[PDB]
Design a binder for this molecule. Structure first.
Ligand SMILES: *[C@@H]1O[C@H](CO)[C@@H](O[C@@H]2O[C@H](CO)[C@@H](O[C@@H]3O[C@H](CO[C@H]4O[C@H](CO)[C@@H](O)[C@H](O)[C@@H]4O)[C@@H](O)[C@H](O[C@H]4O[C@H](CO)[C@@H](O)[C@H](O)[C@@H]4O)[C@@H]3O)[C@H](O)[C@H]2NC(C)=O)[C@H](O)[C@H]1NC(C)=O
Ligand SMILES: CCN(CCc1ccc(Cl)c(Cl)c1)C[C@H](O)COc1ccc(NS(C)(=O)=O)cc1
Ligand SMILES: *[C@@H]1O[C@H](CO)[C@@H](O)[C@H](O)[C@H]1NC(C)=O
Ligand SMILES: *[C@@H]1O[C@H](CO)[C@@H](O)[C@H](O)[C@H]1NC(C)=O
Ligand SMILES: *[C@@H]1O[C@H](CO)[C@@H](O)[C@H](O)[C@H]1NC(C)=O
Ligand SMILES: *[C@@H]1O[C@H](CO)[C@@H](O)[C@H](O)[C@H]1NC(C)=O
Ligand SMILES: [Cl-]
Ligand SMILES: [Cl-]
Ligand SMILES: [Cl-]
Ligand SMILES: [Cl-]
Ligand SMILES: [Cl-]
Ligand code: NA
Lengths: 358, 363
């Protein structure tokens, strides 16, 4: 008899529950498991956020999970209630597909890592594009919400680390007539425009920009994933450059990698002395898991190089490092891949970029 | 006059009879609506216990609002209540204990209000203490506990605008979401030179930070620590690691006792409802359950908030802030003395700080 250590998961379907079970079975096969051996405990998202918090207690923390994998579900339900409840006890949560930058805030999400980067980290790719194509003067348009300001904070950090941002313009999310904003950007000399916005806000920008004839030749538009997804694509100018996080939405892949990291971290944890068990259930327990913060340190320091989604490391916010992006270019109204960011390096492929105008 | 349900939840030993008999100013409800209060007891203050208790209340009876008191030092109770209040759009008042410990950045949909001073007001009070005794040179230490930015910025904003010779020497940020087996926090604390040190954290975090501070010689004479209400917390519970001479702002049931507070809670929720029924010929229907709040979203609102924050009762202004704190709290500056008991040494009332000693006492 070895010691059974439960990993938890809130996942999107029963097919993905089975994938999680199977990943853990492989972790046990791959590892030496005479001392500790993992057990998979899992559940699908509940329809609302109270029911979900309760399910974490009743289904997961009742089984003394050392960690909880969490996916973004299908088709208003965030990881948040799982991060809240698990964090009450300092049980680490691993986000699989969530990409909002708010989950990088420690005050809000104590024990949260994720195997995908926040949207704001796309600035890392923009910046390498700016050096590559020698855009030294850019205008930055972002939405005045958390995600927009996250992208500005991140890019301005890279610029004040060269190329410069001639001006930064913010607009109130929801606004439909952005002619005022875009006329302010039109008057400046710089014709390279970077955008951070949600799907529907980017649509507003694209339209207004087209009215003011700012999507033609001379102008360059550099953008993220949200701003060329679904609706945003319907009105996007031709020539626009955008990004897609490779494997960003493959829940199966991120389950496989998250389990590999977590298994490694668990075995590394039990190399140390004085490891305590998590609390058995929520009822009557109000103390944090004493070993929670150590296990987080171990997770955060974890390196898995041979991962399905590439090279798994985490930065100081517990966000994925060395993510890989498709560099996309809207050509005759088709999203065409013109390159990848391979984690550190831009690699242009043989498909030629067509800029706005060309 | 129609009755509205008000649950009063009491965690830990408390005189239900002294509480019920104080609300005998129920013959002092004159409005469009009368309170139908029901005392519930609760034994546990984990998330599941608290959630299921309030949600069983809401389904077994017709609750319009909740008045919550507890006897613990657990600031996470505020956070749980705010989550429940925002999900179900029920008014909740944290009047005592952990439930009343500052929660920063309440949900936008929150109808959760707390008896106690804002984070920014305790910071301003802490600077008034320092101005009085000419302690102009100081440093800040915080964790990632929500509010710590609002605290540091309130300090910074105040002393930038001042013809006074403030000198903020150092601001430390301590990550206690990781273990301290690398002696990181010790190596951060080692950088403090200032004789005054403002510490913003939770009570359980202060316990550890003081233990480390002590072992690098930062607790004795020549070092004065000032902390906010929630670190002192329950004053009848003093961790051995707390230094003597620790100063604290405080609101912990000194002159404003529990029976009084439940009275004002029931008053605020009842007045509010009356003001809205007065003026819209309806009040929001209590949620039948919290397990069906994904459906009934478009039918629910935080409309009652405008009125919850503007109640005057028995000639006192019981207004709240948008941020969900009491507007005009009576505060007490306490000092941990040589016999490990918290001692009153000052009052704050009406923007005026009146301290007891002119020359600061020696422990
Ligand atoms: C994303 O793409 C980048 C760029 O291609 C990759 O980073 C490179 O990875 C390769 C490994 O394939 C590294 O290649 C090695 O370079 C060594 C010395 O390079 C120096 O000089 C170069 C250019 O002047 C600099 O970039 C670099 O910083 C060094 O200063 C060589 O000595 C190595 O040779 C060894 O292996 C070869 C195999 O063919 C043997 O024949 C040799 O005997 C020897 O053992 C090797 O060629 C390269 O250094 C990396 N560059 C940088 C900038 O990091 C990333 O790997 C890739 N990322 C992902 C996730 O795929
Ligand atoms: C803002 C949202 N809350 C969520 C809390 C919560 C909400 C709802 C439920 Cl249902 C539960 Cl269960 C918990 C954040 C939470 O309150 C974070 O708590 C702390 C954050 C940082 C610190 N400081 S640190 C990083 O050094 O340890 C301490 C506590
Ligand atoms: C997702 O990744 C898995 C590997 O775990 C792979 O088998 C599958 O083809 C991928 N799915 C997509 C849509 O690329
Ligand atoms: C942990 O260390 C303590 C002493 O601090 C000791 O009493 C106990 O036996 C140890 N337990 C484990 C599981 O290492
Ligand atoms: C709380 O515990 C006491 C005994 O300590 C018991 O009498 C009471 O029924 C309990 N109430 C609840 C709600 O658990
Ligand atoms: C509500 O606030 C207004 C000022 O905004 C003021 O008349 C009073 O404080 C409140 N009105 C009442 C209590 O009738
Ligand atoms: Cl439980
Ligand atoms: Cl190309
Ligand atoms: Cl109970
Ligand atoms: Cl919430
Ligand atoms: Cl605490
Ligand atoms: Na994190």
């Amino acid at each position: 008899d070895p010691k059974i250590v439960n990993i938890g998961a809130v996942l999107s379907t029963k097919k993905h529950e089975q994938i999680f079970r199977e990943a853990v079975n492989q972790a046990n096969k791959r590892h030496f498991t005479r001392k500790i051996q993992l057990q998979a405990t899992s559940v699908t998202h509940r329809p609302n956020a109270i029911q979900m918090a309760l399910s974490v207690c009743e289904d997961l923390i009742s089984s003394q999970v050392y960690a909880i994998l969490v996916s973004h579900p299908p088709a208003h339900l965030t990881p948040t209630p799982i991060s809240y409840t698990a964090g009450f006890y300092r049980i680490p949560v691993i986000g699989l597909t969530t990409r909002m930058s708010i989950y990088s805030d420690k005050s809000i999400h104590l024990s949260f890592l994720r195997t995908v980067p926040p949207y704001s980290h796309q600035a890392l790719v923009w910046f390498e594009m700016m050096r590559l194509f020698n855009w030294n003067h850019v205008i930055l348009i972002v939405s005045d919400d958390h995600e927009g300001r996250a992208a500005q904070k991140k890019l301005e950090t890279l610029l004040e680390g060269g190329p410069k941002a001639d001006k930064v313009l913010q607009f109130e999310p929801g606004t439909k007539n952005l002619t005022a904003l875009l006329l302010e950007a039109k008057e400046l000399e710089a014709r390279v425009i970077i955008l951070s916005a949600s799907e529907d806000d980017a649509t507003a920008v694209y339209k207004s920009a087209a009215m003011l004839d700012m999507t033609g030749a001379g102008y360059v538009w550099l953008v993220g994933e949200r701003e060329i997804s679904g609706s945003a694509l319907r009105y996007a100018p031709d020539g626009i450059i955008g990004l897609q996080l490779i494997n960003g939405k493959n829940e199966s892949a991120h389950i496989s990698d998250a389990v590999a990291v977590v298994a490694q971290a668990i075995h590394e944890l039990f190399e140390m002395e004085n490891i305590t068990d998590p609390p058995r259930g929520c009822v009557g327990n109000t103390n944090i898991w004493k070993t929670g913060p150590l296990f987080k340190r171990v997770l955060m320091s974890s390196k898995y190089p041979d991962g399905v989604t590439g090279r798994i490391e985490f930065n100081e916010d517990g966000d994925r490092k060395f993510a890989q992006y498709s560099i996309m270019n809207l050509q005759n109204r088709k999203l065409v891949q013109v390159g990848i960011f391979n984690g550190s390096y831009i690699i242009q492929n043989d498909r030629k970029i067509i800029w706005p105008g060309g | 006059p129609p009755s509205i349900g008000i649950a009063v939840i009491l965690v830990g030993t408390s005189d239900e009879v002294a509480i019920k008999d104080a609300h005998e100013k129920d013959d002092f409800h004159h409005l469009s609506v009368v309170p139908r209060v029901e005392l519930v007891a609760m034994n546990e203050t984990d998330p599941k216990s608290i959630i299921t208790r309030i949600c069983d209340l809401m389904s077994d009876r017709k609750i319009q609002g909740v008045v919550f008191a507890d006897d613990t030092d657990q600031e996470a109770i505020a956070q749980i209540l705010d989550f429940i209040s925002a999900q179900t759009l029920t008014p909740i008042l944290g009047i005592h204990g952990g439930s009343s410990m500052i929660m920063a950045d309440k949900d936008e949909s929150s109808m959760f209000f707390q008896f106690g001073p804002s984070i920014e007001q305790q910071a301003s009070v802490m600077l008034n203490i320092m101005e009085e005794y000419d302690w102009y040179i100081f440093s800040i230490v915080t964790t990632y506990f929500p509010g710590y930015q609002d605290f540091v910025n309130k300090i910074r904003s105040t002393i930038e605008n001042s013809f006074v010779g403030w000198e903020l020497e150092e601001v430390l940020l301590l990550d206690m979401s990781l273990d301290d087996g690398d002696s990181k926090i010790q190596n951060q604390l080692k950088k403090l030179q200032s004789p005054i040190i403002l510490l913003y954290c939770t009570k359980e975090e202060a316990t550890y930070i003081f233990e480390v501070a002590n072992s690098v010689g930062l607790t004795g004479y020549g070092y004065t620590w000032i902390v906010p209400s929630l670190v002192a917390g329950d004053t009848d519970t003093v961790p051995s690691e707390f230094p003597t001479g620790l100063i604290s702002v405080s609101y912990d049931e000194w002159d404003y006792g529990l029976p009084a507070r439940v009275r004002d809670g029931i008053a605020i929720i009842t007045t509010a409802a009356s003001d809205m029924l007065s003026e819209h010929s309806f009040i929001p229907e209590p949620k039948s359950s919290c397990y069906n709040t994904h459906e009934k979203r478009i039918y629910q609102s935080n409309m009652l908030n405008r009125y919850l924050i503007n109640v005057t009762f028995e000639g006192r202004d019981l207004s709240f802030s948008e941020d969900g704190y009491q507007m005009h709290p009576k505060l007490v500056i306490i000092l941990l003395n040589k016999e490990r008991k918290w001692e009153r040494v000052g009052k704050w009332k009406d923007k005026s700080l009146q301290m007891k000693y002119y020359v600061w006492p020696r422990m």
